[PDB]
């Protein structure tokens, strides 16, 4: 009964303290509607934090568990725990001699850090990372590995703002190891954590590369579990947003055959993601476009330009359009894209409700044309302009002249003025 429990918590006797606190732990453990607020109203959160420094590990544990589940509630409920000064103590408890106390401290810090980026940063400010990274390297207990990895992902997670880089960066070596874990759940949280850190500028990508992480990520693209594949894919995608040499690391770890496979994944998200990743590889140099061609990725893409949802058609559009970048250096590539039937599905997208997509399809089609114009002058017509005319594409370019986006209509005009006078 609630007021007797309050009495127990404020008793100075360790056994009264422990019976009471356990009852609170159990009540905050309810599956449906834990009365977090009623508990908070009683005034005991301050006590639970005192209990965190008792020499009796059991009350440390029960207190930590109660606190963990208050911090599992709303932002204001979490803040009550933060206000009480629990976080610097939880960091001390990462060094407790008693493994369950350490684990519960890890768990509490996960929940607190998970409430928001500001909260995340607060926890990092209290020196949480280093002792967490240590537990991750030493512990053999699977539950602790699961918990500490998940909590590590919460330390990495968030963009408004992102964690300070030098502060969170030491996580990379530990994550490089956790992705070889034999546990699926560790694998998942590790991969998510990596995808948060790899989402950034090229220097951050570089740090991921030099931790040695790319090789195992690519291998995890083909993991049985879509829950593993998704964040591993996300991370590989992030990497190839880097420069050409950084992108080349991903090619050299054999990602292209995996990306070819992932195009046929049963999850829409993975397919869409796979296309986005490929588009950033075909945004690269001539040789990297050629890699995508030699991997037979182009036909599935061109197929996806017509099939599956619009978000998919959008990403495939970027991928194919990007691939038309080297008409000057290696025009053989465009002629290959044309021969695999890219023109007609590109023309279709000119009527896309998204203006960026219209521009991307228009760009691709201008590059297609310039090669046909080079083949024309070395022969007598531009056969690419002809196929664009008779497939109905010329009329769709014509309609782009009524588009208001300056980039779009001016681009559409010159194509008509140049290849369709």
């Amino acid at each position: 009964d609630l007021p007797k429990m309050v009495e127990g918590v404020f008793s100075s006797e360790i056994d009264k303290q422990i019976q009471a606190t356990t009852k609170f732990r159990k009540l905050l453990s309810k599956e449906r509607n834990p009365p977090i607020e009623e508990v908070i109203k009683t005034g005991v959160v301050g006590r639970f934090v005192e209990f965190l420094r008792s020499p009796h590990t059991l009350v440390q544990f029960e207190a930590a568990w109660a606190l963990t589940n208050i911090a599992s509630g709303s932002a204001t409920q979490t803040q009550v725990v933060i206000e009480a000064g629990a976080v610097p103590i939880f960091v001390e408890l990462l060094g407790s001699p008693e493994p369950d106390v350490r684990e519960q401290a890890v768990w509490a810090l996960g929940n607190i850090a998970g409430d928001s980026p500001q909260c995340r940063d607060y926890v990092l400010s209290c020196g949480a990372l280093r002792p967490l990274l240590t537990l991750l390297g030493d512990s053999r207990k699977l539950s602790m590995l699961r918990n500490a990895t998940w909590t590590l992902s919460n330390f990495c997670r968030g963009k408004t703002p992102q964690p300070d880089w030098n502060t969170i960066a030491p996580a990379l070596p530990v994550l490089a190891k956790l992705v070889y874990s034999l546990d699926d759940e560790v694998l998942i949280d590790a991969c998510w954590a990596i995808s948060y850190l790899s989402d950034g500028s090229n220097d951050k990508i570089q740090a991921v590369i030099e931790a040695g992480i790319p090789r195992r990520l690519v291998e995890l693209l083909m993991h049985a579990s879509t829950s593993v594949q998704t964040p591993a894919l996300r991370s590989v995608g992030n990497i190839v947003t880097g420069d050409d040499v950084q992108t080349q690391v991903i090619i050299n770890c054999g990602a292209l055959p995996c990306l070819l496979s992932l195009l046929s994944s049963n999850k829409d998200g993975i397919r869409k993601e796979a296309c986005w990743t490929i588009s950033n590889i075909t945004a690269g140099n001539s040789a990297q476009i050629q890699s995508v061609i030699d991997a037979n990725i182009i036909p599935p893409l061109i197929h996806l330009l017509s099939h599956a949802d619009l978000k998919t058609r959008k990403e495939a559009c970027w991928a194919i359009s990007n691939a038309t970048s080297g008409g000057l250096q290696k025009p053989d590539q465009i002629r290959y894209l044309v021969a695999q039937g890219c023109i007609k599905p590109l023309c279709d997208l000119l009527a896309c409700p998204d203006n960026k997509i219209i521009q991307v399809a228009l760009d691709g089609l201008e590059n297609i044309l310039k090669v046909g114009e080079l083949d024309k002058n070395a022969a007598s017509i531009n056969r690419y302009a002809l196929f664009i005319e008779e497939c109905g594409g010329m009329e769709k370019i014509h309609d782009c002249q009524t588009n208001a986006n300056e980039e779009i209509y001016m681009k559409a005009y010159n194509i008509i003025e140049k290849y369709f006078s």
Binding site: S195, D199, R234, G237, N238, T241, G242, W276, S279, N280, A283, W318
Partner: peptide, 6 residues
Amino acid sequence: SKRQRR
């Protein structure tokens, strides 16, 4: 050149 987000 290259598209972020993510």
